[PDB]
Design a protein around this nucleic acid. Structure first.
Ligand SMILES: [Mg+2]
Ligand SMILES: [Mg+2]
Ligand SMILES: [Mg+2]
Ligand SMILES: [Mg+2]
Ligand SMILES: [Mg+2]
Ligand SMILES: [Mg+2]
Ligand SMILES: [Mg+2]
Ligand SMILES: [Mg+2]
Ligand SMILES: [Mg+2]
Ligand SMILES: [Mg+2]
Ligand SMILES: [Mg+2]
Ligand SMILES: [Mg+2]
Ligand SMILES: [Mg+2]
Ligand SMILES: [Mg+2]
Ligand SMILES: [Mg+2]
Ligand SMILES: [Mg+2]
Ligand SMILES: [Mg+2]
Ligand SMILES: [Mg+2]
Ligand SMILES: [Mg+2]
Ligand SMILES: [Mg+2]
Ligand SMILES: [Mg+2]
Ligand SMILES: [Mg+2]
Ligand SMILES: [Mg+2]
Ligand SMILES: [Mg+2]
Ligand SMILES: [Mg+2]
Ligand SMILES: [Mg+2]
Ligand SMILES: [Mg+2]
Ligand SMILES: [Mg+2]
Ligand SMILES: [Mg+2]
Ligand SMILES: [Mg+2]
Ligand SMILES: [Mg+2]
Ligand SMILES: [Mg+2]
Ligand SMILES: [Mg+2]
Ligand SMILES: [Zn+2]
Lengths: 116, 110, 142, 154, 101, 47, 53
RNA sequence: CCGAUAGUGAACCAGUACCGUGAGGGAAAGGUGAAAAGCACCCCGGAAGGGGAGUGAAACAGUUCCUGAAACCGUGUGCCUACAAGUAGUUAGAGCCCGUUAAUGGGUGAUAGCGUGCCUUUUGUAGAAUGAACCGGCGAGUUACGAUUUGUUGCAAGGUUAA
RNA sequence: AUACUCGGGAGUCAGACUGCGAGUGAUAAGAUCCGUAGUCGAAAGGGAAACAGCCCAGACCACCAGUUAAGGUCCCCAAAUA
RNA sequence: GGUUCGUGGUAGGAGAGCGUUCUAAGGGCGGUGAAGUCAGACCGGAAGGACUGGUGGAGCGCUUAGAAGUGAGAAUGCC
């Protein structure tokens, strides 16, 4: 029996074109450039899931560095202080204290100064 | 309510018809007709008949007031192309598209 | 998730007046670039502009260590053939000190649209006087 | 295939210079009305397993009908004349209700005609009892006379 | 008052009545979860752990055992005919925080 | 006839080459790159 | 000599920003009560505005 | 076995049209509706075409008239856009607009970080090497008979028939 | 914690650079030809501005967690104006 | 059922599968709307599969098995 190409090709290409929604011009209309755009969007998204974790740790560190310099510590001294003090609060949490309750952050920086 | 008129499959490339239809879109029908009368294009007399048909339809089928009518919509859609050939140099034949237009005009009371 | 992100206008941009008298051109510049980018605030958000306005006064007295006054050359190209002009840092400190500090600091700001906004927050003066008294600027120490 | 399709023969245009893809026949398989590349060729699909396997199979499918109380054995099965009404009445007496293979062997006459116009029901002499025919039928109705004939072969 | 607790190899700031998503805990929809690992306690009289504030628990009730919105993980190497699509839905537990102690 | 289960291992699914790179037999369809053994009807005679 | 790349829809549309007609310079008449080109004779009245021809 | 690019070259006035001095080459092109009930009449228009009215289950079934995808062409408008250097996304992300197969939702995207299409061929290609204007269809390890090896099943010092 | 033997199925027979040891060359070549180790090829990630072949190091998937390698810590740009 | 060691990959070997047309058997859907087509924020580790609504107006799934003209983005491919 003969099997004509019917429906499966259209169904597969239309899914890919839909994943390219929002892309500039031909990249959201045409299967061939849509398919490349979607492949590349996934590649970037895989890479950026690793880069996002690095990005946020750099943002926290910058904010802790700021909050610690208002206490006459640098980030390098404060984090050394906390390690010696035994405090295990991570950078995402310190960065949040350094924005939301600076009183608490100053208490931790006090503990740090004491350990040094 | 609003009145429609369409001239389907007019020999007149859509681009050439759109450049004129763009002048009337949203005007009062009185003014629109004057714009078509003093716009010296091949599209002008064709678009005028569609627009005057729309106004007749609006006056006879829907008893609307022809003194209070604005062109609500006016657009040109591509009709089926007549495919032709022009013999060029070196025995070669280059394609000619004798394009057609669907001219739609919609008048609305306000 | 939960990391704070400054919104435009949220963080209070303050006005600082910095006396440049006898500080290395860099050394002055690197500190100011930090104040402009708002790197000294825990509210620092890399995509916003949480930084302060900076007025530099006495830029004619900025310091140039070694032979930089005669040997540090600032280049401009018009984009016409052979259209390369040069000025010495010393000549430029004497005549266009405003321009010397602006060049110096413009190189230590991010090279993007936000970096171009930051540079608009910098006000350099050859002498000791500015006309920004209305912004009630606070003295800042390096 | 490309040899059997009408025409082709000539190169459609010269190998080089025209700026077109090289082509050897308007009936090459990538052309619209061109030859198919492989595709069906008339062949037989028939094959037999060894005789002892084919016997084991018929014995096994029979034993499976007995294991499921699907085999009914009639003393005899005869109709004075072809009458499908009479045959349908017969099946209601046996309580068949489903598809059923009827296996007779001489003596029984007018049975084939009586049951020819019933949709589920198939009638065969005892000589023709095949695995596929028994597999295609829920119940197996066989006369005693037939049973002897089937045991004579197996 | 708010606490910093170590769950799922991560730390989160919790206030009473807050809803948090964490890495999948053992629990049924209603079960009370306890957090023995409390790094810090906030408000008046701050308590700093060294590490963990001795005898400090955060008690939460389990609101939902779920899998996150579908992610597609796709990798390819140009010119090497290599592609690998893989779906992912990270399990989570929704908690409502009862009380810091 | 609606629950035929042929003997386990008695039948396998044939390998189809040149149907995509996911299968591992896409493109060159197991022949590798170029030379006489990559060509249709290619292959030196037996010995 | 020839286009290196096809022109995109956006780019083609930007080039045509200026390819358009201007409205005719016309006003209503006094006599006719109808529209006419300034400095032309009005054919509805069959004359030059109100000045008879 | 095919189901209108398939199946004959040819479902249709096809070896036709068309091409060629000639031998010869050789297409494209199926579908209103159950029934013509195939749109009286009115209206704009020279007509074409249309809008009503009417027929019909449907006319967005209106004499090339089942369905009617994509490219491509338009109209409308929610978000953005005229200091910007862009493989066009991706991650972070305000603001504004929405509200779903209701779930750590949808649209848009100021601004920030990161980021050299796809394929082929190569020691090595973003490649200033090859191929593709776009979209759609079609388009490449098959079958026969032998050989060999693995698996399965039957029987077993036997096994098996061919015509 | 592999090895060997027997079978079924391959692909490969253009290699590249770096270090070390040689030849050819001019003790030239991103040269050529061997030996030997590595990486690339067929390896993404971090560093070396960018940079197959160098330094660090091997990506099963998710995380707005942590520690380290090379390389870094005045600003661009995370960390010492130690 | 658990511990331990693993899980970059081209040519290539091995395995398990998705989907297409057709057949058989069984069991179903469908003018209270089949296939197709359009849309969507659903489901599965992938190939892929549903559900709902529009269009459409008569056929089509599912299960087990079988058989293949069985899957296209590239051929200066053909139309
Ligand atoms: Mg880390
Ligand atoms: Mg001529
Ligand atoms: Mg021939
Ligand atoms: Mg060309
Ligand atoms: Mg044919
Ligand atoms: Mg297989
Ligand atoms: Mg294989
Ligand atoms: Mg392979
Ligand atoms: Mg390929
Ligand atoms: Mg090849
Ligand atoms: Mg070779
Ligand atoms: Mg080979
Ligand atoms: Mg045909
Ligand atoms: Mg068709
Ligand atoms: Mg139609
Ligand atoms: Mg500017
Ligand atoms: Mg602007
Ligand atoms: Mg180029
Ligand atoms: Mg080309
Ligand atoms: Mg064999
Ligand atoms: Mg060399
Ligand atoms: Mg060597
Ligand atoms: Mg190679
Ligand atoms: Mg690498
Ligand atoms: Mg780099
Ligand atoms: Mg490469
Ligand atoms: Mg560390
Ligand atoms: Mg820094
Ligand atoms: Mg690994
Ligand atoms: Mg692997
Ligand atoms: Mg079908
Ligand atoms: Mg095929
Ligand atoms: Mg194509
Ligand atoms: Zn007048």
């Amino acid at each position: 029996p003969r099997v004509k190409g019917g429906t499966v090709t259209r169904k597969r290409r239309k899914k890919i074109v839909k994943l390219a929604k929002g892309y500039y011009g031909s990249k959201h209309l045409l299967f061939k450039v849509a398919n490349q755009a979607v492949m590349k969007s996934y590649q970037y998204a895989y890479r950026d899931r690793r880069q996002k974790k690095r990005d946020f740790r750099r943002l926290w560190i910058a904010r802790i560095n700021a909050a610690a310099r208002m206490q006459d510590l640098s980030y390098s001294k404060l984090m050394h202080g906390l390690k010696l003090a035994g405090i295990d609060i991570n950078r995402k949490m310190l960065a949040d204290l350094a924005v939301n309750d600076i009183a608490s952050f100053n208490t931790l920086a006090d503990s740090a100064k004491k350990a040094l | 309510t609003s009145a429609k008129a369409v001239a389907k499959t007019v020999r007149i490339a859509p681009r050439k018809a759109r450049i004129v239809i763009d002048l009337i879109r949203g005007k009062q029908v009185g003014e629109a007709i004057a714009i078509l009368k003093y716009t010296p294009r091949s599209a002008s007399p064709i678009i005028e008949k569609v627009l005057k048909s729309a106004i007749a339809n609006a006056e006879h089928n829907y008893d609307l007031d022809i003194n209070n009518l604005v062109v609500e919509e006016a657009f040109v859609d591509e009709g089926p192309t007549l495919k032709r050939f022009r013999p060029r140099a070196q025995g070669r034949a280059s394609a000619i598209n004798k394009r057609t237009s669907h001219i739609t005009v919609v008048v609305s009371e306000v | 998730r939960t990391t704070y992100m400054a919104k435009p206008g949220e963080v209070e941009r303050k006005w600082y007046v910095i006396d440049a008298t006898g500080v290395s051109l860099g050394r002055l510049s690197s500190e100011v670039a930090s104040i402009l980018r708002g790197k000294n605030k825990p509210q620092f958000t890399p995509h916003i502009d949480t930084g302060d306005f900076v007025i530099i006064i006495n830029a004619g007295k900025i310091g140039l260590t070694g032979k930089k006054a005669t040997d540090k050359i600032y280049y401009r190209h018009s984009q016409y053939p052979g259209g390369l002009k040069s000025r010495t840092a010393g000549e430029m400190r004497t005549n266009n000190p405003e321009k010397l500090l602006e060049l110096s600091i413009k190189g230590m700001l991010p090279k993007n649209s936000l970096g171009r906004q930051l540079f608009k927050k910098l006000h350099v003066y050859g002498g000791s006087e500015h006309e920004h008294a209305a912004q009630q600027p606070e003295v800042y120490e390096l | 295939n490309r040899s059997e399709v009408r025409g082709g023969g000539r190169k459609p245009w010269r190998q080089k210079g025209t700026g077109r893809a090289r082509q050897g026949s308007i009936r090459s398989p990538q052309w619209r009305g061109g030859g198919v590349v492989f595709g069906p060729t008339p062949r037989s699909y028939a094959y037999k397993l060894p005789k002892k396997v084919r016997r084991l199979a018929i014995k096994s499918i029979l034993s499976s009908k007995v294991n499921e109380e699907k085999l009914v054995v009639l003393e005899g099965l005869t109709f004075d004349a072809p009458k499908t009404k009479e045959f349908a009445a017969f099946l209601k007496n046996i309580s068949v209700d489903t598809k059923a293979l009827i296996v007779v062997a001489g003596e029984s006459e007018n049975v084939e005609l009586s049951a020819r116009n019933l949709q589920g029901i198939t009638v065969i002499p005892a000589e023709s009892i095949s695995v596929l025919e028994v597999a295609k039928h829920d119940k197996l109705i066989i006369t005693k006379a037939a049973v002897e004939k089937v045991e004579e072969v197996l | 008052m708010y606490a910093i607790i170590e769950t799922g190899g991560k730390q989160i700031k919790v206030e009473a009545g807050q809803e948090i998503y964490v890495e999948k805990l053992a629990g049924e929809v209603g079960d009370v979860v306890t957090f023995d690992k409390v790094l810090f306690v906030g408000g008046d009289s701050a308590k700093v752990g060294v590490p963990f504030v001795e005898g400090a628990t955060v008690t939460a009730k389990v609101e939902k055992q779920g899998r996150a919105k579908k992610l597609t993980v796709y990798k390819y190497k140009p010119k090497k005919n290599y592609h690998k699509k893989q779906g992912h839905r990270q399990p989570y537990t929704k908690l409502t925080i009862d009380a810091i102690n | 006839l609606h629950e035929l289960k042929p003997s386990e291992g008695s039948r396998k699914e044939r390998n189809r080459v040149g149907r995509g790179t996911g299968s591992g037999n896409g493109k060159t369809s197991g022949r590798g790159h170029k030379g006489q053994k990559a060509r249709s009807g290619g292959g030196v005679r037996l010995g | 000599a020839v286009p290196f790349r096809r022109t995109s829809k956006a780019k083609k549309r930007k080039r045509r920003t200026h390819v358009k007609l201007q409205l005719p310079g016309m006003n209503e008449c006094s006599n006719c009560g109808e529209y006419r080109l300034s400095h032309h004779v009005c054919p509805e009245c069959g004359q030059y505005d109100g000045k008879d021809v």
